[PDB]
Amino acid sequence: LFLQGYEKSWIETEEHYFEDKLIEDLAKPGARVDPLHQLILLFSRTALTEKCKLEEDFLYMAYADIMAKSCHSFEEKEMEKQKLLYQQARLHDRGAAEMVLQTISASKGETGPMVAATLKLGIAILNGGNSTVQQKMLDYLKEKKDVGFFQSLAGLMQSCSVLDLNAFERQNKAEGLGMVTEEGSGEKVLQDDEFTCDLFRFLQLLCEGHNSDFQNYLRTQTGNNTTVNIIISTVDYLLRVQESISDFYWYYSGKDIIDEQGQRNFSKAIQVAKQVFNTLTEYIQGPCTGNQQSLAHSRLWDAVVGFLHVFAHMQ
C-alpha cells in the first residue's frame, strides 16, 4: 500500500521540464532531412497508410504532447509574442500542419486518445492568429480534395458530450448509499469536456482573425463532391447542450441548494457552451453573408431562446 500511494501521489507531480530543449536539439542538422522532420514524415506516413481504424500508437500519443508543450511592459509582451511564432515555425514548416490534418482525417469520427492529442497539438501550433499556418492548412485541403477530414470533423462533433441527468442523479444516489470513489472523467456525467473544448477551440482558431477563405470553405467545400456543413453541425451541438443545460436546471428547481457536484458539472457545461458561442462568433465575425444566412436559416433561434429562458431564472 505504501508503494501504491507513492506511485499515486509522489512521482507524477510535475518533476521535469524538457519539452523545449528536446525539440531544440532534435531540430539541429549538425551534419538532407532533420531528425524532427523525419519523425513528422514517419507520423504522416503512418496516418496516410490505409487502414480501417486508427490504432493506439503510443509513440504518437507520447510525442504529440511533447511537441504541443514545446510551444508556450511592451517589449516584454512583444518578445514572447515573437518567440511563440518562432517556436511554431520550428515545427509547422516541417510538415506538422499537414500531419495534424492527416491524423484527424484518419480517424473518421472516432473519439479517442489519438484525436484528443492531435487536437491539442493543433491548438499549440495555431495559438494566436497564425494566418500562415491557416493558409498552409487551407492550401493543403484544397490541393488534396479529401472529404475524410470534414466528414471526420462532423462525426466527431456529433458525439462529443452531453450532460445527462440520469447518470448524475444515479451517481448522487450511489454517493448517498456508500462512499464510492469519485469518477475521474467528470463523474461519468460529462465525457471528455476538455476534448470538446479543444475541438471547438481548434475550429475557432482555424477561422480566427478574419480568414474569409476558410470561413467559406467550412460552409461549402467547393471543389469536392459531398461537401458537409460545419456551421450546421456546430449549431446542432449548441442546441443539444442548450437542451441539456435546460434539463439540468429544471432538475434544480424548488431546492435552493447547489452542492459541489451541482456546481462543477454546471460550470463545465457553462465553459463548453461559452466555447461553442465563441466558435460561432468567430465563424460570423467577418461580414460573411454566407455564414450569416446559414445561421439565420437554422435552429440557432431555439437554442438562444432556451438560453434566455434559463438565464432569466438562474439570475
Partner: protein
C-alpha cells in the same frame, strides 16, 4: 562440401529455404519437433556453422536462426513475457541493494549487481532417442551454454575488429550477414539470463569506451542495437524498482511502529473531549488505502502529517536520490547522443528503425515514465511463500504460451490443467491484487474470445474450453471486491455472445451470462453503474427466446413448443441479479426493466401474455400435465413441463423482486405507485392464489424435475411485494387454500425426508 554452395545458386537457395522450414516447424514452443530437428541436423554442426568464416551468408543466417529457435527461443520468450512484472520478495538478501550506488561520483553499470526478483527458472532435457517413453520433454533440448557464450564473445570481438578497418570481404558476403545474426544471438543470450557480472562488464567494455556504436553500421544492425539498448534500460528500471522496494521495507518498518506508538500514547493520555473522536475515527474508519494516502502527503509547506516528522526527511532524501539516479537534474547520455547522431548523419528508411530509435530517445528523456508505468505492476509478498508463487508464475506463463497457439485438443487439455493449477494455488486467495496486477482475467478473456469466435450460431466447439475459462473468471470475480469492477468492463462484450452454452443442462455454472451475473451480483455501486446500453439487448434476447424454440432441441426430439423456456429462464435470472441487490430493488434498473418488458410484450410467456392462452393457472397445470405425460418430452432429458414451470416462476420472481419496495418510498412517491399498478394489471391476484394452491405430493423417493416446491416461493414473494398481506379475510382465505395442505404435507414426516 558445405562451402561449394557459394557457386551453385540453386542448391544454396533450396537449402536456405530448408533451414527456414526447419525453423518454422518448431518456431513457437513446440518441443516434440525440436527434439527431432536437433538430431535431424546435428548438435555440433550448428557450432561449426556459426564459427566458420567462409559461409555463403544465407546458410550462416539460417543456421543462426535455427540454433536460436531449437534451444533458446522458448526460454527467451518465456523470460521476455514476464519482463514488465516486477515481483520481489522481502528476503534479507533483497534488503541489501538499498544503497543503489549513485553518490560519491559514480552511477554503477547496467545489469551489474543483484536482482532478487521472481523470474521463470530454466531447465532443458537431454535429447535421447534410445530411451523409450520419455517423460514429457516439456521444456527444451539441452545445449552447452558456456561454450556458446565464450564463442559469442570471441566472435563478436573478431567482428568489431574486422569492421573497424572496413575490409571488402565480410564474413558471409556483406556486412549485414556478418553482424545481424551475431548480434541477434548475443541479444537472445543476454535475454535468457547468462553473462554474469564479469562477462557483462566485458560485454559493456565492448561498446562503452568513451567501439561499436561509433562505427558505420547498416540499418538491420542498428535495429538490433536499438533492442540491445532497450534491454539495457529495462534492467536499470528493474534495479530502480528493487532499490525502491528495499528502501520502502525500512520506511514502513519505521512508520508502522511509530503510528502504533502514537496511537497507544493518545489512547493512554485519553483526555476525552469532542475532538478526540474526530482524531481517532482514522484508526477504525478510513481503510488503509486512504489512511496511507492521508498520512503520506508533504510536498507543500504543511499538511496534517502526524508526529513522526523524522521519517519525512529520510523520505525526501530517498526521493532526491531517485531523482538524481534518473535523468532529472551515463547511459542516457550516450543513448541520446547516438539516437540523434544517426538521424543527423543520414535519412533512415525502414520505419521500424526510426520508430525504435525515437521510442528509445523519448524513454531516455522522460525517465520517470517507466517508473510511473511499472510501479502499478510491481508487487512484494514475503520471504517464505516463494515456491507457490513461482509455480503460479510458471502456470501463467504456460497459459500465455498456449494462448499464443491455435486451439486444439491437446492445447485445450493443457490450458484446463493450467487453470486447475492456478485455481488450486494458495496465492490466488492470499494475494488477490497480484492477479489483477498480472492481468490473469484479461488473459483468460482473450483466450475465451478465440474459442467463442469463428461463428455465432453455427458452432460452439470446445465447450469444456469455454466452461473452464468461465468458471475461473467466476471464481476470480467472486473472491474480491475490485475484481468485480474489473470484470464489469468486459461484461459489455460477453453479453453479445452470451447466447452460447445455453439450452443444455451440462453447464449450470460456467457460462458467459453466469459470469456477467457473478460480476454484477451483490454490489450496489456496480448495479447502479450498469446503465442501459445492454438491458435492451438482454430484453431483445429474451423476446427472441420467447418467440422461437431451440433448433438443437427440435433436433434432439422435443415436441417443438412454440417458445423456449431455457435461454429465457437464464435471461430472467440475469435480469433478477441486475434488479435485486442485497434485499433492496434498485429503483432505476427496476423501472427501466419494467419499461422494456412492457415495450416488448413478447418477453412474457405466450400462455400468460397474448390473445391466446389465459394465464398462469392453466399454464402451470398444463406444464405439470405435460411433465406427467412423457409423450411431450425427449424420448436426464429436458422435461418441457418442468422447464416451462421454471421459466414462469423465474419471470414471476423477477417481477416480484422488481416491485418498487415495502412502501418506504412508495408511500410518498408516484412512479412507484405507477409501477405497482402496472404489475398488478399485468399479473392478476386470482391467478397467483390459484397457482400457490396446488398442494404438490409428498413422496421410496421420487423425481424432483417437476412442480418443485421452490416454484411456490416465487409466487409468495410476488404476493408479499406487489400486493402484500394487510386484509384479514384475505389472509385467512390464503392460509386455508394455499398453506394448510402444504403445511400438513411438510409436517407428515417420520424418516422419509428426501426434500429439504
Amino acid at each position: 562440401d558445405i562451402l561449394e554452395l557459394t557457386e551453385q545458386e540453386e542448391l544454396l537457395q533450396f537449402h536456405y529455404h530448408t533451414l527456414r522450414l526447419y525453423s518454422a516447424v518448431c518456431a513457437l514452443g513446440n518441443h516434440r519437433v525440436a527434439h527431432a530437428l536437433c538430431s535431424h541436423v546435428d548438435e555440433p554442426q550448428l557450432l561449426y556453422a556459426i564459427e566458420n568464416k567462409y559461409m555463403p551468408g544465407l546458410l550462416r543466417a539460417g543456421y543462426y536462426d535455427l540454433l536460436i529457435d531449437i534451444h533458446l527461443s522458448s526460454y527467451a520468450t518465456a523470460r521476455l513475457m514476464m519482463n514488465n512484472e516486477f515481483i520481489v520478495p522481502m528476503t534479507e538478501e533483497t534488503k541489501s541493494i538499498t544503497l543503489f550506488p549513485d553518490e560519491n561520483k559514480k552511477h554503477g553499470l547496467p545489469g551489474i549487481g543483484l536482482s532478487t526478483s521472481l523470474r521463470p527458472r530454466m531447465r532443458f532435457s537431454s535429447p535421447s532417442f534410445v530411451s523409450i517413453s520419455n517423460d514429457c520433454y516439456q521444456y527444451s533440448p539441452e545445449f552447452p551454454l558456456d561454450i556458446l557464450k565464450a564463442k559469442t564473445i570471441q566472435m563478436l570481438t573478431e567482428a568489431v575488429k574486422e569492421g573497424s578497418l572496413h575490409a571488402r570481404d565480410p564474413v558471409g558476403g556483406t556486412t549485414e550477414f556478418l553482424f545481424v545474426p551475431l548480434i541477434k544471438l548475443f541479444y537472445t543470450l543476454l535475454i535468457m539470463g547468462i553473462f554474469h557480472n564479469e562477462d557483462l562488464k566485458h560485454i559493456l567494455q565492448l561498446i562503452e569506451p568513451s567501439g561499436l556504436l561509433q562505427m558505420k553500421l547498416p540499418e538491420p544492425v542498428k535495429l538490433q542495437m536499438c533492442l540491445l539498448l532497450q534491454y539495457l534500460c529495462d534492467c536499470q528500471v528493474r534495479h530502480r524498482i528493487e532499490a525502491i522496494v528495499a528502501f520502502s521495507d525500512d520506511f514502513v518498518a519505521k512508520l508502522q511502529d511509530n503510528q502504533r506508538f502514537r496511537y497507544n500514547e493518545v489512547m493512554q493520555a485519553l483526555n476525552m473531549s469532542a475532538a478526540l473522536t474526530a482524531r481517532k475515527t482514522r484508526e477504525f474508519r478510513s481503510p488503509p488505502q486512504e489512511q496511507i494516502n492521508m498520512l503520506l502527503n508533504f510536498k507543500d509547506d504543511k499538511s496534517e502529517c502526524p508526529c513522526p516528522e523524522e521519517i519525512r526527511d529520510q523520505l525526501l532524501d530517498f526521493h532526491e536520490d531517485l531523482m538524481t539516479h534518473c535523468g532529472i537534474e551515463s547511459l542516457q547520455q550516450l543513448i541520446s547522443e547516438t539516437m540523434v547522431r544517426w538521424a543527423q548523419e543520414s535519412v533512415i528508411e525502414d520505419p521500424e528503425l526510426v520508430r525504435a530509435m525515437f521510442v528509445l530517445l523519448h524513454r531516455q528523456y522522460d525517465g520517470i515514465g517507466g517508473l510511473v508505468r511499472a510501479l502499478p505492476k510491481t508487487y512484494t509478498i514475503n520471504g517464505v511463500s516463494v515456491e507457490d508463487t513461482i509455480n503460479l508464475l510458471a502456470s501463467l506463463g504456460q497459459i500465455r504460451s498456449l494462448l499464443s497457439v491455435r486451439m486444439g485438443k491437446e492445447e485445450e487439455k493443457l490450458m484446463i490443467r493450467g487453470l486447475g493449477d492456478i485455481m488450486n494455488n494458495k496465492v490466488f486467495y492470499q494475494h488477490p491484487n497480484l492477479m489483477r496486477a498480472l492481468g490473469m482475467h484479461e488473459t483468460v478473456m482473450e483466450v475465451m474470445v478465440n474459442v467463442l469466435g469463428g461463428g455465432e450460431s453455427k458452432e460452439i466447439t470446445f465447450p469444456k474450453m469455454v466452461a473452464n475459462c468461465c468458471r475461473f473468471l467466476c471464481y476470480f470475480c467472486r473472491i474480491s471486491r475490485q475484481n468485480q469492477k474489473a470484470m464489469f468492463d468486459h461484461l459489455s462484450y460477453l453479453l453479445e455472445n452470451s447466447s452460447v452454452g445455453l439450452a443444455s443442462p451440462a453447464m449450470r455454472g460456467s457460462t458467459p451470462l453466469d459470469v456477467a451475473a457473478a460480476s454484477v451480483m451483490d454490489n450496489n455501486e456496480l448495479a447502479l453503474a450498469l446503465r442501459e446500453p445492454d438491458l435492451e439487448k438482454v430484453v431483445r434476447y429474451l423476446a427472441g427466446c420467447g418467440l422461437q424454440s431451440c433448433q438443437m432441441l427440435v433436433s434432439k426430439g422435443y415436441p417443438d413448443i412454440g417458445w423456449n423456456p431455457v435461454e429465457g429462464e437464464r435471461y430472467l435470472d440475469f435480469l433478477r441479479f441486475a434488479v435485486f441487490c442485497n434485499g433492496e430493488s434498485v429503483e432505476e434498473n427496476a423501472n427501466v426493466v419494467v419499461r422494456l418488458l412492457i415495450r416488448r410484450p413478447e418477453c412474457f410467456g405466450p400462455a400468460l401474455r397474448g390473445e391466446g392462452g389465459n394465464g398462469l393457472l392453466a399454464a402451470m397445470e398444463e406444464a405439470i400435465k405435460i411433465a406427467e405425460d412423457p409423450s411431450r418430452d425427449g424420448p436426464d432429458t429436458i422435461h418441457m413441463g418442468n422447464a416451462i414451470m421454471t421459466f414462469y416462476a423465474a419471470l414471476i420472481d423477477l417481477l416480484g423482486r422488481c416491485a418498487p419496495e415495502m412502501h418506504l418510498i412508495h408511500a410518498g412517491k408516484g412512479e412507484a405507485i405507477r409501477i405497482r399498478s402496472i404489475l398488478r394489471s399485468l399479473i392478476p391476484l386470482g391467478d397467483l392464489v390459484g397457482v400457490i394452491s396446488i398442494a404438490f405430493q409428498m413422496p421410496e423417493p421420487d423425481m424432483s424435475a417437476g412442480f418443485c416446491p421452490d416454484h411456490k416461493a416465487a409466487m409468495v414473494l410476488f404476493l408479499d411485494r406487489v400486493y402484500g398481506i394487510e386484509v384479514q379475510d384475505f389472509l385467512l382465505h390464503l392460509l386455508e387454500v394455499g398453506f394448510l395442505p402444504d403445511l400438513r404435507a411438510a409436517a407428515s414426516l417420520d424418516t422419509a425426508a428426501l426434500s429439504x
